A paper describes a structure:
N-methyl-d-aspartate receptors (NMDARs) are ionotropic glutamate receptors widely expressed in the central nervous system that mediate excitatory postsynaptic signaling. NMDARs are heterotetramers usually associating two GluN1 and two GluN2 subunits. The NTDs endow NMDARs with a unique capacity for allosteric modulation, harboring several binding sites for small molecule ligands that act as subunit-specific allosteric modulators of ion channel activity. Crystal structures recently established the existence of a "phenylethanolamine binding site" at a dimer interface between GluN1 and GluN2B NTDs.
Numbering used by the authors:
A (entry chain B): 32 to 52, 59 to 393
B (entry chain A): 23 to 96, 102 to 185, 209 to 407
The structure:
Amino acid sequence: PPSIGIAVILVGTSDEVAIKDFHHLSVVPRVELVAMNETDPKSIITRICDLMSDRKIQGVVFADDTDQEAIAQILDFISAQTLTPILGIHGGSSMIMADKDESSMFFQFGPSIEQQASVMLNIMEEYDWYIFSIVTTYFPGYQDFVNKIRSTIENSFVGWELEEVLLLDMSLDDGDSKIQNQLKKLQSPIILLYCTKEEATYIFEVANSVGLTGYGYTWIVPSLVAGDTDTVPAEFPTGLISVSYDEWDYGLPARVRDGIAIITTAASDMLSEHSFIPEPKSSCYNTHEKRIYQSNMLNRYLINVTFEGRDLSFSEDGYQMHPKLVIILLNKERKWERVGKWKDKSLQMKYYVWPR
Amino acid sequence: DPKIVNIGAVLSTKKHEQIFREAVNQANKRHFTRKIQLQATSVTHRPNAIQMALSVCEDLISSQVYAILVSHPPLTPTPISYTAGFYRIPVIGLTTRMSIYSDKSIHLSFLRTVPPYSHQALVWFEMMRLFNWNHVILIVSDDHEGRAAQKKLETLLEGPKADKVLQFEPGTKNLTALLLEAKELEARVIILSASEDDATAVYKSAAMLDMTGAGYVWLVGEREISGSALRYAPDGIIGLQLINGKNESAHISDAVAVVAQAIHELFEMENITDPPRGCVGNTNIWKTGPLFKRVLMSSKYPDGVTGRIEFNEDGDRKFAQYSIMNLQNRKLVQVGIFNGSYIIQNDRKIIWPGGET
Ligand SMILES: *[C@@H]1O[C@H](CO)[C@@H](O[C@@H]2O[C@H](CO)[C@@H](O[C@@H]3O[C@H](CO[C@H]4O[C@H](CO)[C@@H](O)[C@H](O)[C@@H]4O)[C@@H](O)[C@H](O[C@H]4O[C@H](CO)[C@@H](O)[C@H](O)[C@@H]4O)[C@@H]3O)[C@H](O)[C@H]2NC(C)=O)[C@H](O)[C@H]1NC(C)=O
Ligand SMILES: Cc1nccn1Cc1cc(-c2ccc(F)c(C(F)F)c2)cnn1
Ligand SMILES: *[C@@H]1O[C@H](CO)[C@@H](O)[C@H](O)[C@H]1NC(C)=O
Ligand SMILES: *[C@@H]1O[C@H](CO)[C@@H](O)[C@H](O)[C@H]1NC(C)=O
Ligand SMILES: *[C@@H]1O[C@H](CO)[C@@H](O)[C@H](O)[C@H]1NC(C)=O
Ligand code: NA
Ligand code: NA
Ligand code: NA
Ligand code: NA
């Protein structure tokens, strides 16, 4: 069978041996594990572009050890510019990237903005936490976060009360104490925060000054704010609740296996139906000339892959369709603790009475 | 020996690079530069977006630029905005009029010396107050641009009212269903927002439905009286042209004046850090980026070549000047100016579709 080149890019300390641990499809994968030390735009662009010139790269599987959401953005850009599938399977590469390019072939192992907002409301209905406020930054997806909450709350016969919706500008200096003034408006026992991990550290520092992080105030945050659970910023408040992707049972060697399976199956299926697959781009520096000879045709296949009887499919926004989410709580020892599971649109909490 | 502060630029040609180099030199001459002295660093646009993103790193961020000026090429400012925005290095759009660059959420540190096409609603509104068009029909393309114009006009209206808004799919050639809706209505003042190719399709359909004659008024922007849109445009149409909108030399001159003043105002403050030297290994934002953005957003340069320079909440140019154009016997005639805040009608008489309403 024909051979497709797949680059597995690993940023940070990882067991390549454990990762290196079957496909009887129309095409076969030629996997090359690649190390990368830096995560700036130049480094990522250069690494991928160099790999594409050397081998015939059909798709990329990317994993990183960082809390850098901008990695998803750099990858989306590369993917759309070179019409090459890139899968963000771990780290900042899997952090929500709202409004991916029209020409994007970038897919992420992680929950969408909408699913997380939905999970958040399920946690609230469980403990009868109906009175709340929303705080977001301009981090892309904020509009999607607020709208999902709003639409849900509107079409529900439950006594939901959305007190305030704050929008904070992080792009300017806070020499005027605007954020502080805005945060002072907050009176709700529950606060839904949608922003980045680096933005949350600032928000929380100010929220504390205004006495909004203690007992009586519960902050619920998305996956990206918690980021890497081993990096707990000092300013994060004790009792912080977050949604997390299963880092416990869905390990890195499994994700790499699944990444390879998606690219290989999608290629096999396209070849089986059209008697061709896309020719891997020889260069990044001819994208302008060559674009009438290229398309994102493989997306119709990458979005719908099934392997070992597992529905590996993706949403129209390039996020995993059916993830197992974990509900985490930042304890008194400043360590993240598992307090719930989000399975088959069903939430299963550890506690009936939420503890202090 | 002063501290050298680099200013970057992505310009169209080597002539324009020499204009930037000269504008920075004159800045150094006109200001007190014993403490801080500017240095011009520039490149021309690269053939593709990846090459451009790379060039921003390799040629500009490598030189520790405090800001990057960007002209629309002879391909967009997006890869420059994205790469510099990663570090929170402010970007100054000199000629880009697309509304999408006003979105703070995706263009993280971006200002422009030209307003977006949606700000043409400010002129239309003033035109409506002046000619007492209390009932209008707004036809917009169902794209970011079309919707940005609608959002902008609706804000000003909320006296004169928009009886109905009609959106169409970009690229649609048979618009007679949309225009038949508009014909049924009492209002005979039509405001259009569409690209050259889409404006052409509206004009062709409207002429077929005999809607480009007496009793009708067409109020349009710049894109709709440009290129092919002009070939099929009804006579009597009123459109706009942003004065100096396309003069990259004038915008280099004014952006450098604004940036130079902002740099000197910034160094009046304490704990000013340098931007990162190069991209490789640098993944944190420039800590002085947000303060420098605030200093820029609030800069006022009254004696600019393109006028009074100030920026709005989105860092878009305020007090922009427009030529009020009128298509008379298939010639574009200037009938007035929107000076930044007021309409000034010249001695050339408006000919409405037909004669005089
Ligand atoms: C775009 O076009 C507009 C419209 O003309 C310009 O705005 C006007 O600019 C002139 C000149 O700068 C201003 O004139 C000054 O008006 C003062 C009184 O203004 C009041 O009354 C007027 C008329 O009713 C109102 O429009 C206005 O809101 C005020 O309530 C006078 O006191 C001034 O006189 C003094 O200064 C002049 C020199 O400037 C001397 O000659 C006099 O001797 C005297 O000392 C003066 O006449 C006018 O106020 C502005 N109008 C508005 C609406 O703001 C814009 O400047 C122009 N923009 C650009 C970029 O060109
Ligand atoms: C967050 C989001 N949702 C929808 C759009 N965006 C913005 C965005 C940023 C970049 C990006 C960011 C940094 C960087 F350095 C580069 C360089 F690689 F081109 C690109 C690429 N694609 N989209
Ligand atoms: C990354 O760091 C290790 C440190 O020993 C080095 O061996 C490796 O070559 C570095 N990677 C690159 C791309 O230079
Ligand atoms: C997904 O894949 C299956 C094959 O397992 C195929 O039969 C089906 O048509 C695909 N679904 C969609 C929605 O395209
Ligand atoms: C462009 O601007 C410069 C001044 O900045 C001027 O010399 C030149 O005449 C202007 N061009 C046009 C076409 O008016
Ligand atoms: Na193409
Ligand atoms: Na001097
Ligand atoms: Na802006
Ligand atoms: Na006139």
